[PDB]
Design a protein around this ligand. Structure first.
Ligand SMILES: OCc1csc2ccc(Cl)cc12
Ligand SMILES: OCc1csc2ccc(Cl)cc12
Ligand code: NA
Lengths: 302, 305
């Protein structure tokens, strides 16, 4: 029993973290095969962050401007190229600890684990979700740029996030491993702010199913709802619209508990209207939206 | 910025997880040097669990009755012995990935990371606290037994917990790595229950300090109090008593925020008496007590391993 915000075992990503230094700036890099991936703003001064011309900054760099350090060993750079907002540094050594991996760009609502790192050294691991406004609610300090987010389905590491910045509201923005930012953000010190965030409705529903699985039923009721009537109510609580896709993905959790999706939607409607009256669901006094349907099935059945 | 329930990187411990099978029961083992550690109830059957004589049950098993698989490769058991409630299986091969490590016993209120495993394969990592009633609120399914809890201090893994059982309320119980149980629990099929839990007061204060560090300040006020006065309130709300030792531990946090410990207990005083008034603290409507003061420091500092 029990239900926890659970991250993936981080060992496969730990063996990939290196330190990248350029000038006075040092951050983290991801060392896979003979390539080290890191945020391209490593080549920027503070003067440059307002309107950096990354092509012009990079052209003035040679390979030996980049110090890559893997634990105690210095890695020697033999090439460099820019792909969108990541720098790709070719090094003379393939990482002997390179796991089975792929790059995946994820959708809002998808979860993943973050390995926070400083100076190429892993500090901790925690579970995150891509918010609907394409930010993540992480825990990052200065020097954490280049830390990555990942899933491990079987023993293949699916890299989906690399940390680039913290926005004014204390949330975090970054790119996929192709260097494409999630959301409308840029690696540029502009007046950019996270859009108004919303609750991930399909995830709350999955987390309610998880409560029924672990033996809780107090929040159910005898009512049902149409999909559109539910969405009309939910968006008045800043909840994400629920789509038929979301209804389909919840199917297996509906079968395991015997509660139709729109019946659980009716229970979510009543919870939003009533609260919990001094009660808790799976140990929380708020409705949790950072567990996906997939996450619930992995932790409750295996 | 930001504050999240953070676990230690689990790589050093992932390389020690093995699968141990004895008969039809299979669980997880910890492979360090040339010894594999696992709960001794692996040798028991369903009828043995109601009243096992582990001494007599072990003297009847032999080395070949233990199938230990290090993922791919089979490990050969050359010897077996008991220390308290853990079984020590000598193997023919030393683990090449053995990290620097110690066996430590933690105190209730201290936190640690749990690497949940099934059939010797790690499946997830999460952060736990030893509750004052000596249980932990983990997430475990059948086959999780033998999973381990740990902290990392520089390069050294400090093993503190090994999973043994789940209680009727869905919380979990286990031993240190020397086989001594946390809490008044035994490894037999008997009527066992978690006692009434209490809230780890020093940890709630540490988490309020974490909230001030992250810009949550609405709960601060102009008042202060005394250790004696606040502990009267803590007892009323099923909070652990706050000691002068706790105040000394919160020193480093009381300096970084410039808010005295007794000053913050006044805030917690008012939160316990009047509630939250619809507002949240670090994204929570409850008072979180599974962050130690060190946890809050290390996360707002950047300490890495
Ligand atoms: O991390 C350095 C930095 C300073 S301002 C700004 C804006 C965007 C990004 Cl990605 C980075 C930075
Ligand atoms: O799964 C083994 C088992 C059955 S009942 C009981 C009570 C305590 C402990 Cl530690 C184990 C067990
Ligand atoms: Na005060």
């Amino acid at each position: 029993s029990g239900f926890r915000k659970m991250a993936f075992p981080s060992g496969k990503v730990e063996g990939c973290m290196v330190q990248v230094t350029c000038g006075t700036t040092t951050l983290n890099g991801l060392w896979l095969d003979d390539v080290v991936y890191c945020p391209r703003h490593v080549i920027c001064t503070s003067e440059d962050m307002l309107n950096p011309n990354y092509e012009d900054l990079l052209i003035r760099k040679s390979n030996h401007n980049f110090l890559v350090q893997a634990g105690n060993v210095q890695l020697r750079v033999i090439g460099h190229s820019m792909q969108n907002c990541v720098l790709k540094l070719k090094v003379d050594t393939a990482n002997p600890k390179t796991p089975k991996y792929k790059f995946v760009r994820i959708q809002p609502g998808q979860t993943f684990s973050v390995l926070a790192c400083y100076n190429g050294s892993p500090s901790g691991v925690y579970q995150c979700a891509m918010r609907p406004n394409f930010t993540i609610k992480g825990s990052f300090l200065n020097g954490s740029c280049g830390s990555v987010g990942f899933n491990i389905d079987y023993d293949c590491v699916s890299f989906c996030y690399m940390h680039h910045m913290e926005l004014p509201t204390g949330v975090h923005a970054g790119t996929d491993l192709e260097g494409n930012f999630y959301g409308p953000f840029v690696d540029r010190q502009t007046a950019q702010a996270a859009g108004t965030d919303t609750t991930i409705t399909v995830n709350v529903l999955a987390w309610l199913y998880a409560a029924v699985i672990n033996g809780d039923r107090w929040f159910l009721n005898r009512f049902t709802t149409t999909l559109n009537d539910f969405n009309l109510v939910a968006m008045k609580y800043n909840y994400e619209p629920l789509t038929q896709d979301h209804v389909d993905i919840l199917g297996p959790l509906s079968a395991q508990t015997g509660i139709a999706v729109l019946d659980m939607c009716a229970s979510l409607k009543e919870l939003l209207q009533n609260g919990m009256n001094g009660r808790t669901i799976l140990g929380s006094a708020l409705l949790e939206d950072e567990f996906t349907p997939f996450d619930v099935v992995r932790q409750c059945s295996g």
